[PDB]
C-alpha cells in the first residue's frame, strides 16, 4: 500500500545497532518519528525524532539475536489550516 517514506531498509548492522535509510519523498517532511521494539513483543516501543532533511538514522542499544520491528512515521506540518499528522507509515523486520 501507499506509504511515506518508501523503500525502508537496513544499510548496515552490528549485533547491537542498526543503520537504516529510506527514500526522501518529493514532498518535504517536517520531521520523522522512528519507533522500534521487539517484533510481536509485549514490551513497549522506544521512539525518537529525525529531521525531515535527513533520510538516514542509527538505532543503538538493541539486543543481539532478537527480531525487531522498525517503523518510520513521516509527519507533514504547516499552519492551523492544515491538520498536523503523518502519512501512512512503513515498517520492516530485522534480526540482529
Amino acid at each position: 500500500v501507499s506509504s511515506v517514506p518508501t523503500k525502508l531498509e537496513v544499510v548496515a548492522a552490528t549485533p547491537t545497532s542498526l543503520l537504516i535509510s529510506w527514500d526522501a519523498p518529493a514532498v518535504t517532511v517536517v520531521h520523522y518519528v522512528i519507533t522500534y521494539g521487539e517484533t510481536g513483543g509485549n514490551s513497549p516501543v522506544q521512539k525518537f525524532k529525525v529531521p525531515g532533511s535527513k533520510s538516514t538514522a542509527t538505532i543503538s542499544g538493541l539486543k543481539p539475536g532478537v527480531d525487531y520491528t522498525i517503523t518510520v512515521y513521516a509527519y507533514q506540518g504547516g499552519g492551523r489550516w492544515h491538520p498536523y499528522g503523518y502519512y501512512s507509515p512503513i515498517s520492516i523486520n530485522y534480526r540482529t
Binding site: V30, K49, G77, G78, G79, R80, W81, P83, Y84, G85
Partner: protein, 305 residues
C-alpha cells in the same frame, strides 16, 4: 433552563484562503483575523464592515493577538517569524526572528510589554515588545506547541503541545511550576486561562474539552458532543452574559455549553467548513467565528442572553 439565543447578524467575506484565527480588540471596537492568504484583516465588531488589509508575512498566518490598549497586533506565521503591527498605520514595527520553524500561536501579556509564542520547534519564546528581543526560550515540549496564554496579572504562562502536555510557567524565572498529564496522553490542541486566572480550559484531540483547576491538578468539568480530532480549535469562556463555554468544531458548527451543568445549550449552524476559531466580545454577547478553506468567511453572532 436558561439558554442563549445567538443569531447570525453578519458574514465577513474578503479573505482569499482559509481563515485561521479571529480575535476581538479589548476595547470591543474591532475584530482582527489571520488567514492562510498571508493577510490580516480588520473589521468592525458591531457591524462587521471591512476596515483594513494589513500584510507583510511571506507565508500563511495561524494566530493573531491584540495588545491591552487595542493599538498593537502580533501575528504567528509559517515564515518562522512573528511580526508586531501598529493597527492604526498597519505597518510592521518589529519582526521577531528565532523560532526556526512554523510559529503557530502568540499572545500579549496584560501589561503588553511581553509577547509569548509557540512553534513547531517545540519551544516557547518570551519576546520583548519595544526591542523585539527574545528574552527567554523555554524548552517547553517535545512536539509542536499548539497554544500559549498569560494569566490576568501576566505572572504565568500556560502551554499545550501534541506531546499531550499542559505546562504552567513562571513568566519571571521561565521555570515550570506544574505539568498537567493524562495517562492516555492525547494531543492537547488548545489551552487558555479563565478570566479570573484560577482555571484552565484545555482541548484534547479526542473530541473533549475539560475545565481544569491548576492550583490543584484536578479536572472539574468535561464538555463533549462536538468533533475535534485533527485541528487546533480555539475555545472561550463566555462571561459577558450567561456563563458559557464556546468552541468551534469539525462538523462546521459552533458549540456552546453550560459551564456548570456541562450541557450543550446551542449549536450555531451556517459555516461551510470546519470552524477553527471562536472569539467572545469583552462587553457584549457577541460571538465571532471563522472557518477553513471551503468557508473563507467570518461570522458575527449576537444574543440577548
Amino acid at each position: 433552563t436558561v439558554k442563549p439565543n445567538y443569531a447570525l447578524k453578519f458574514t465577513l467575506a474578503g479573505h482569499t484562503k482559509a481563515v485561521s484565527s479571529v480575535k476581538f480588540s479589548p476595547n470591543g471596537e474591532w475584530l482582527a483575523s489571520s488567514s492562510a492568504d498571508k493577510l490580516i484583516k480588520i473589521w468592525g465588531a458591531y457591524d462587521g464592515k471591512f476596515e483594513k488589509t494589513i500584510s507583510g508575512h511571506k507565508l500563511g498566518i495561524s494566530d493573531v493577538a491584540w495588545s491591552s490598549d487595542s493599538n498593537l497586533l502580533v501575528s504567528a506565521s509559517d515564515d518562522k517569524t512573528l511580526k508586531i503591527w501598529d493597527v492604526s498605520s498597519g505597518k510592521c514595527l518589529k519582526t521577531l526572528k528565532g523560532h526556526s520553524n512554523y510559529v503557530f500561536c502568540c499572545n500579549f501579556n496584560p501589561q503588553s510589554n511581553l509577547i509569548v509564542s509557540g512553534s513547531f520547534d517545540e519551544s516557547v519564546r518570551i519576546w520583548d515588545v519595544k526591542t523585539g528581543k527574545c528574552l527567554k526560550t523555554l524548552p517547553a515540549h517535545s512536539d509542536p506547541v499548539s497554544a500559549v496564554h498569560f494569566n490576568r496579572d501576566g505572572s504565568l504562562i500556560v502551554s499545550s503541545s501534541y506531546d499531550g502536555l499542559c505546562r504552567i510557567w513562571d513568566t519571571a524565572s521561565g521555570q515550570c511550576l506544574k505539568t498537567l498529564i493524562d495517562d492516555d496522553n492525547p494531543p492537547v490542541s488548545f489551552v487558555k486561562f479563565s478570566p479570573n486566572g484560577k482555571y484552565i480550559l484545555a482541548a484534547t484531540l479526542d473530541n473533549t474539552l475539560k475545565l481544569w483547576d491548576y492550583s490543584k491538578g484536578k479536572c472539574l468539568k468535561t464538555y463533549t458532543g462536538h468533533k475535534n480530532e485533527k485541528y487546533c480549535i480555539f475555545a472561550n469562556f463566555s462571561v459577558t452574559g450567561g456563563k458559557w463555554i464556546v468552541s468551534g468544531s469539525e462538523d462546521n458548527l459552533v458549540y456552546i455549553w453550560n459551564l456548570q451543568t456541562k450541557e450543550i445549550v446551542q449549536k450555531l449552524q451556517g459555516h461551510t467548513d470546519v470552524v477553527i476559531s471562536t472569539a467572545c466580545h469583552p462587553t457584549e454577547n457577541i460571538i465571532a467565528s471563522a472557518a477553513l478553506e471551503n468557508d473563507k468567511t467570518i461570522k458575527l453572532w449576537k444574543s440577548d442572553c
